């Protein structure tokens, strides 16, 4: 139960797991690899369970008319609209947006948004072509082929190799890091939102779209909590913050991620009742159990799982970060899943 | 064979081994045949990791150096390894500039490659000019001032102010101003205007470099907050 | 009338109107054509693998043997297009949630009449079947143009109870304080959601927030941690105001269970008043006698 | 004269350098000088470090090699290239079992000293076992057989079993029943038997020894709970 360090000179890109810069030289814990700094050690304890300034790292009117959309099959219903395969040059997923009659202070709040969501262009992320006021309101987006990951893990709950899973995780991260990247909230991460393109791809959709969802009564937009809580953030249950949809809250939500494709299962599978979780979980009292995990997963992966779930959402880590984090072990994880060895000794002092 | 080469230099940089991949870049630029944008990224990375190896090794012995504080023979070793490694630090920058402007400088089609290569020569000069005390770094100093400063007049001309190679320009001739000059508030200028400039064109972020992009800016705010102080 | 239905089907069945809007499930008033009645169709939409799904099917099928006139009468239920279909008998007067907003408020001597029909609801679902309503409240208390007022939406598959909590996510809660931490004291929480809905219908407000609106977190909250609501002093028979004072006790023990409610001073009463429910009812809605 | 060198091979491990170590301790066991505690124990980090790069490096290109089968020969290159790893792999951990028949073994006067030099010994025909297949495999296995067969034997008569080289030598010699031989529930009870004796004689430590006793001993039910499922 105790840390042992080793002077090490890290030779990738890494971040500090107390001051989260750029890390070139300091220490590592050869138990999990909870990494950090020499100059804040002073400041940080052990967690398992003047200086030379950094230089340059290594390099590696959008408005559908009528008589265009042949609205198809309804598909189904979510926590603002209903989905329908439409015909738009090609398959597209039209989006009755539960919002009718938005006034012309949330339409002009929403063809705004509309603006930055139709200027995404990522491999990770669902292509947003636009949206349709003849017919009310419906959000025209890629149409996915395949099916959804809650679809793949709780329906026929065919579960992957390490390998594959932590790539889902991996490009989950890459879409999610661009949209922060664009200073964009995604209020909805969850694995009803993943779609695998033909197998391989991961696309993240019901991304942004906050004027669309809490229905406004004027020139006001009161986040009426709705839809699903089992990604929501505690600090998001509570609706008290006046703005509870930050990054962190989508960082929490993709933590609840991570834990459905870790253990193939929802959070908390011991309770018969959705309001007990809300209270719970927004008082913080409630966390997802971290003793339902697979008997090989690694304490520098299953970590940051834990990090993403910490209840003070100033603790959770960033997307830069996570996607650092992901990618480090996905290079250690065939060579680590072999049975362990003798550790060098102690070798440190502070 | 040209991809033999690439793919041999590829596969050592996966293993980790920066000796064998060193070798096999300087046999790939020996032949004297003109990179593409891929072929480039991987000589920077060998001659940065192997350069970076021995500037951790050289910090480390100049901090026990200057930690011991007594009269022995301890401090005559240390030295004697300090001067080691520092000739060894000396052989591989001259073995790149030597194998830089023989083969790729002088043949740049590409404005964007000679910005490039600028910024490396300018980098390893200054990598020469923080450990060589003496006459010697009055040389390196205005040579690597020349470089940058020509890498400088290209990045302003013809590069974005949202392209990772300005950016990265930006940041090595910042620090190189805080650092081997000690005029700060020409580089805290520097900084703040390069800074301001890439707030310009934000919306203009494709997915080619977001990271990049971010990466060094939340690294020139870092040096900012810090210089600042 | 039921064994005049056999095996329910999706295209046995034609479209009339609809009953109102859900949080998670949709109710139709549709024609069973092969036996010629107007059944009350509920249509809940759960993304479950088949094996839960099945076991929902099988533990509804207990709903064929809940027949008493505390109630609502159940015809089948069966899977089709992605959908769980409850068919049950329809009542035409709604629930005491749609009779409310009608009435304005519910007279005393109307809710003493609803308070047997309930406890004697509860009753009969936890002597005959041994199973804990877990959802009274003012919507799930159903009345007809007859003057029946029945129970309906009792939690007699424990797999449908999970499957929901899961899926949807509720505005308006009448669960007991003792639940929301995670204490199960049988149907104590079942008389804690009777006391809440007496209170809100009689008041004419929500019985959550007292003037003398909250997010769902604000108003669990409030229920643990704040003393249970109560009826307007003066307006109220104290026998009333006591009964509803013994509903809303937060202490799961101390608080009334159905043997002592049945016998409290307020039930007596009502079961001796006569009240014409079926003739009020009717004049509130609109119908005609 | 000892004391300097003992002091620049100290200044190597400071400074990450391992191969200017692992000279710097093979030349001063090379005159056969009373080896103490700290001198063999600088020794055991630097030929671990040297040969545990290398191997990690091996285990990589291993695995890039059968990645995908259904392929050119870029296999052809990669499996030379491995021998090449082989050819700087196998010969530097001779340059050890030499140094062991040279000086450790005959010039060891304590059995504390024996038991460790011999789990060393074993530990390098273990490294040795993983590369090497066919007949060699068989000739390399067996050297370790013997090994640790005459270290246990001292580990059990003459320390105690809460002892940290006589819990490494049980946790080497079970990795060595797991991985080579293949015998999991031998490697199993073998574990349960030196857990079960140290739980069963505990709080009999030295103040420094609540460190290094209690990091094996979670590594070996690190390796009981992963070997259980
Ligand atoms: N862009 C799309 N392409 C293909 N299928 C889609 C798309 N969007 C939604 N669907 C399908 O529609 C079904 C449910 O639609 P949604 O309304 O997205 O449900 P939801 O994700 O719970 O709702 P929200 O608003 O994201 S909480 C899913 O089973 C999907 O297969
Ligand atoms: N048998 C019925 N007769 C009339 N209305 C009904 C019947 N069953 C359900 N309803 C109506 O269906 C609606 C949906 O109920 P439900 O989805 O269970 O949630 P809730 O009762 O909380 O609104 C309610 O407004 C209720 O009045
Ligand atoms: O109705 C329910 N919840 O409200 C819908 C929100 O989707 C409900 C909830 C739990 C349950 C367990 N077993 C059946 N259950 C329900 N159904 C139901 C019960 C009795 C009758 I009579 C008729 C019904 F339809
Ligand atoms: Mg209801
Ligand atoms: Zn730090
Ligand atoms: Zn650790």
Not at chain 1, 115 to 128: A, P, Q, S
Not at chain 1, 229 to 236: C, G, K, S
Not at chain 2, 202 to 227: F, G, H, P, V
Not at chain 3, 68 to 84: K, L, M, Q, R
Request: aromatic content about 8%; charged content about 25%; some cysteine.
């Amino acid at each position: 139960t105790t840390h042992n360090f080793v002077r090490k000179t890290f030779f990738t890109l890494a971040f500090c797991d107390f001051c989260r810069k750029l890390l070139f030289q300091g220490f590592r814990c050869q138990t999990c690899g909870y990494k950090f700094h020499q100059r804040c050690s002073t400041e940080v304890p052990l967690m398992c369970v003047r200086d030379r300034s950094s230089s340059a790292p290594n390099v590696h009117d959008w408005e559908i008319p009528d008589g265009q959309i042949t609205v198809g099959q309804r598909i189904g219903s979510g926590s603002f609209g209903t989905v329908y395969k439409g015909k738009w040059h090609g398959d597209v997923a039209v989006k009755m947006l539960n919002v009718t009659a938005p006034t012309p202070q949330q339409l002009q709040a929403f063809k705004n948004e509309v603006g930055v969501l139709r200027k995404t262009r990522h491999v990770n992320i669902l292509l947003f072509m636009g949206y349709s006021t003849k017919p009310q309101l419906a959000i025209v987006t890629q149409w996915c082929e395949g099916s959804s990951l809650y679809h793949h893990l709780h329906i026929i709950e065919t579960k992957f190799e390490m390998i594959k899973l932590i790539d889902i995780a991996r490009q989950t991260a890459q879409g999610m890091d661009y949209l922060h990247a664009k200073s964009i909230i995604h209020r909805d991460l969850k694995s009803n939102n993943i779609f695998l393109h033909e197998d391989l791809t991961v696309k993240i959709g019901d991304f942004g779209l906050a004027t669309v969802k809490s229905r406004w009564s004027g020139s006001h937009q009161f986040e009426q909590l709705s839809g699903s809580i089992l990604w929501m953030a505690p600090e998001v249950i509570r609706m008290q913050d006046k703005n509870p949809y930050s990054f962190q809250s989508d960082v929490y939500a993709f933590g609840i991620v991570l834990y459905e494709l870790m253990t193939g299962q929802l959070p908390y599978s011991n309770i018969n009742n959705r309001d007990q979780i809300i209270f719970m979980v927004g008082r913080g009292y409630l966390s997802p159990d971290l003793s339902k995990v697979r008997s090989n997963c690694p304490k520098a992966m299953k970590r940051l799982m834990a990090e993403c779930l910490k209840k003070k959402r100033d603790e959770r880590p960033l997307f830069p970060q996570i996607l650092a984090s992901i990618e480090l072990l996905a290079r250690s994880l065939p060579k680590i899943h072999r049975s362990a060895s003798e550790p060098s000794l102690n070798r440190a002092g502070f | 064979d040209k991809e033999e080469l690439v793919q041999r230099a590829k596969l050592a940089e996966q293993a980790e081994r920066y000796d064998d991949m060193a070798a096999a870049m300087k046999e790939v630029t020996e032949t004297g045949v003109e990179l593409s944008n891929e072929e480039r990224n991987l000589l920077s990375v060998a001659y940065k990791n192997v350069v970076g190896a021995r500037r951790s090794s050289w910090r480390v012995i100049s901090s026990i150096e200057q930690k011991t504080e007594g009269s022995e023979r301890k401090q005559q070793m240390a030295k004697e390894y300090r001067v080691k490694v520092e000739k060894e630090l000396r052989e591989i920058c001259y073995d790149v500039l030597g194998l830089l402007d023989k083969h790729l400088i002088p043949k740049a089609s590409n404005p964007e490659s000679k910005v490039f290569y600028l910024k490396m020569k300018g980098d390893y000069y200054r990598y020469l000019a923080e450990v060589a005390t003496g006459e010697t770094r009055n040389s390196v100093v205005e040579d690597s001032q020349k470089a940058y400063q020509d890498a400088f007049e290209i990045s302003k001309a013809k590069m974005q102010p949202t392209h990772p190679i300005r950016l990265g320009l930006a940041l090595n001739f910042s620090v190189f101003y805080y650092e081997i000059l000690n005029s700060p508030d020409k580089a805290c200028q520097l900084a703040k205007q390069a800074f301001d400039d890439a707030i310009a064109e934000l919306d203009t972020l494709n997915e080619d470099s977001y990271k990049d992009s971010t990466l060094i800016m939340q690294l020139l705010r870092d040096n900012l907050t810090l210089w600042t102080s | 009338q039921k064994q005049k239905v056999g095996e329910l089907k999706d295209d046995d069945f034609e479209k009339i109107s609809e009953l109102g809007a859900g949080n998670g499930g949709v109710v139709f008033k549709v024609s069973h054509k092969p036996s010629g009645l107007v059944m009350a169709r509920k249509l809940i939409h759960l993304e479950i693998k088949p094996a839960i799904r099945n076991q929902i099917i099988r533990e509804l099928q207990v709903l064929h043997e809940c027949n008493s006139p505390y109630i609502v009468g159940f015809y089948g239920a069966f899977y089709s297009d992605g959908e769980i279909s409850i068919c049950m008998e329809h009542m035409d007067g709604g629930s005491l949630d749609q009779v409310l907003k009608k009435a304005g408020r519910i007279p005393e001597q109307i809710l003493g009449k609803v308070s047997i029909a309930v406890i004697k609801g509860l009753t009969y679902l936890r002597e005959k079947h041994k199973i804990m309503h877990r959802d009274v409240k003012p919507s799930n208390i159903l009345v007809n143009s007859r003057g029946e007022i029945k129970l309906c939406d009792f939690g007699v598959s424990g797999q449908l109870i999970d499957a929901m909590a899961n899926a949807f996510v509720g505005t308006r809660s009448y669960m007991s304080p003792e639940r929301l931490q995670g204490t199960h004291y049988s149907v104590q929480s079942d008389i804690w959601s009777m006391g809440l809905s007496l209170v809100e219908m009689a008041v004419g407000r929500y019985p959550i927030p007292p003037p003398d609106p909250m997010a769902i977190f604000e108003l669990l909250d409030y229920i643990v941690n704040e003393p249970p609501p109560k009826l307007p002093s003066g307006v109220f028979s104290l026998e009333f105001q006591d009964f509803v004072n013994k509903c809303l006790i937060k202490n799961p023990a101390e608080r009334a269970d159905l043997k002592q409610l049945m016998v409290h001073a307020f039930i007596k009463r009502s079961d001796a008043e006569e009240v014409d429910f079926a003739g009020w009812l009717c004049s509130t809605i609109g119908l005609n006698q």
